[PDB]
Subunit: 250 residues, 4 copies
């Protein structure tokens, strides 16, 4: 029987590449998404055409609220519903926008940035563990620049720091249940075609290894490693995939 994974925010970009790569490795996948319904269904179609009945979509808002625990539990439930098991959880979904200290309310900024980046991963991790030869693991998508943060992104940065804290705490506490917990910390990756060519090149030049952002495949390679049998002693570890960006001083 093929193991099954949940990838949050999987309809596009790095989450999509993670889902594709896990599918290519033999996983059945729950493609979770929030607003990108067309991209999600189109991805699930391509994967199921490749192998029947090995991909489903699952919609959920991961903004913090009093029903967020039930939403997270239902994402987990959808994987058991569809495939009878849940071996891997990848927490990739993330809100990302500036929140200067000096048109969303601050309440909403808090709920979106802290919810997606930290509270949802915590509640999904609860639900993952509670619901449980086997190679069980969680991979959190962290951020290699967490200690040299982007100006005015304080709530985003707080959320990613909390995610490292969850990675550690959960690796510690889920170790006796055989569940490993680790992270992948991207530097700059897959800059949106949207963004100006001059701004993208600004970021690119700073990266020592090749003066280029990471491809989505490159991030995904690190995730595949941590879920594999090749990482069975690895827990509480966070792998930077940043081309040395975090080593460059101002």
């Amino acid at each position: 029987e093929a193991p099954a994974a949940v990838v949050t925010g999987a309809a596009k970009r790095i989450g999509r590449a993670i889902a594709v790569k896990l599918h290519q490795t033999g996983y059945r996948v729950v493609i979770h998404y929030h607003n990108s319904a067309e991209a999600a269904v189109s991805l699930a179609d391509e994967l199921n055409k490749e192998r029947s009945n090995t991909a489903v979509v699952c919609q959920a808002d991961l903004t913090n609220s009093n029903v967020l625990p039930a939403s997270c539990e239902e994402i987990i439930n959808s994987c058991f519903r569809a495939f009878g098991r849940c071996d891997v959880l990848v927490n990739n979904a993330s809100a990302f926008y500036p929140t200067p200290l000096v048109g969303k309310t601050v309440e909403t900024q808090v709920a979106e940035l802290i919810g997606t980046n930290a509270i949802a991963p915590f509640l999904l991790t609860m639900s993952f563990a509670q619901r449980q030869s086997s190679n069980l693991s969680i991979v959190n998508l962290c951020d290699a620049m967490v200690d040299q943060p982007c100006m005015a992104f304080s709530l985003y940065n707080m959320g990613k720091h909390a995610l490292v804290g969850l990675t550690q705490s959960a690796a510690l506490e889920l170790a006796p249940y055989g569940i490993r917990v680790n992270g992948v910390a991207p530097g700059v990756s897959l800059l949106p075609v949207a963004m100006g060519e001059e701004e993208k090149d600004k970021w690119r030049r700073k990266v020592p290894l090749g003066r280029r952002e990471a491809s989505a495949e490159q991030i995904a390679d690190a995730v595949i490693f941590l879920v594999s049998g090749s990482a069975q002693y690895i827990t509480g570890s966070i792998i930077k995939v940043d081309g040395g960006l975090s080593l460059v001083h101002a």
Copy 2:
């Protein structure tokens, strides 16, 4: 004119020692509290008996909610209203209890532990900044955050986010001349009512004297960071833990 400080969770223990020591240095203080009303009031009395019109109290729940921004703004307002200025913020209030991954609801646990330890500090920081000399914020962190207590994952997530705020706010608020730093205790002031074997177990692991920190020892590191001797220091977290975080399993 004497500078003014807000101290959250200041009615008891480390927050109290922090308020007293700032007061002793010349600060006027806002004593924030949540449930410890008598202790907050008795402390203001004691400080005002030393120097009159130098201490007030302000009650607020710092649980995450749709009204937390406004409560935080009022905590800062209460310092301006009483004293005409606000030079220092100490983010000390903290909820602390286990939250196992496997009778409060989980959303309440989330609200309390992430609210007190991180979101409230962020909102207070925003309100403090927005209103703006030697300005500085000191956040009470945790020396054990990378070797955390089993089953305290929300508390640890909150403390990790607080370091993130410390760094981010230090970076963003530097052009205003506001420094943002942290003080990370190890074990301090273990309650009389905790187990004797339990406390002993922690105390014995502490390399520097086999004992917990007193509250005054934590307060010392705060005072230093707010002082004129810390004018170039921002984004730094001082461990005050007797070497405890250095000790392997």
Copy 3:
């Protein structure tokens, strides 16, 4: 044609496991050793029996001294001599013993512990770089417990910190040449018969992931990842392979 790797301290334990796994993936290997000549020679013999002339040995004390720079240069030389190229360097050899602050002289303690653990890795790194779809990389064997160090192992711990520094500095400096530099930080692995039973039991019991030590092959897995094509954007990273041990408080 086939890439080539230098592995230091490769005769026994983790270093041997590394050398074997690189050889299995198709590398030719220089097995460096210091005192373990019988094991080093046997290992190269076994590897050569598998694929002809794909393995050579090279002996060198990596203690710090005036001749250490030429020894390190001859080790790299030995890989170009044998195989025409040197794609991978693995810095694994390490002296390890207590040096209390309060009968080798202390200057010999310095020379051994800092030499093997830091200075030699630096000199091999220089010689590796000076000699230079290609995939060049260095992997340094670090230590997961470096911030919670063993009582009375100051010089060991100083050496390992220095190795972290090299990892970071060299990744930065060698990125423009296409050479990646990373590390792998074991927790406890392969505790020998020679070590006290009390002491061993104390360590194994503290490991969250399964209350046991890492196997050598478990450490080697992480090395193979880092040198692989699936790590092509990773440089300046250190992967803990420690079973969660470094997350456990006193």
Copy 4:
């Protein structure tokens, strides 16, 4: 009677500023130096003019060698010989120059950069402990160790090693009441002789005031760590960097 401090590389710049402040706080001091003989004696003169018999010089090369342990033991011995005691060791001396991977032999580069920045501090610390109240060591680290200067690999390796010593020695020496801590500058007191443009390049990157630290600002942090306000702080490293280490590329 007054306590005593050894300060390495104390003739000029930050070490001098540290020696001066310890002296102003009441310490007697050993001004160690290697080539700056004239500045060193000139400084001891001035300190003894203020209070007689409170300052000596001690010359030593702290390059790694088989005699380095003897030279380190002699520096501590010089403190007991002049003042009858040794309360504070400050490890400040440091070689700093590039050593690219791709006239000094590399063996000499290794010896100077690893000797001054790590091995000498380790052997000074050994000698300090064995020759033994508020006893403490302060190592001058570097806030930029994880984002290092290009081509400074032996320098960066030394400063990392020094972090590791700070930790190991805090752990091991705690049962003897010796605290071990560090101060990590960012950019401080850039050479008046270094190019203006280069200097402004670094100064512009510093969030807190777009300027380097004064030597006095670094010393303030040292002074705190040796003081009675830091009695429970060991194994801690205080960044004094104006936020420099927080700024991304």
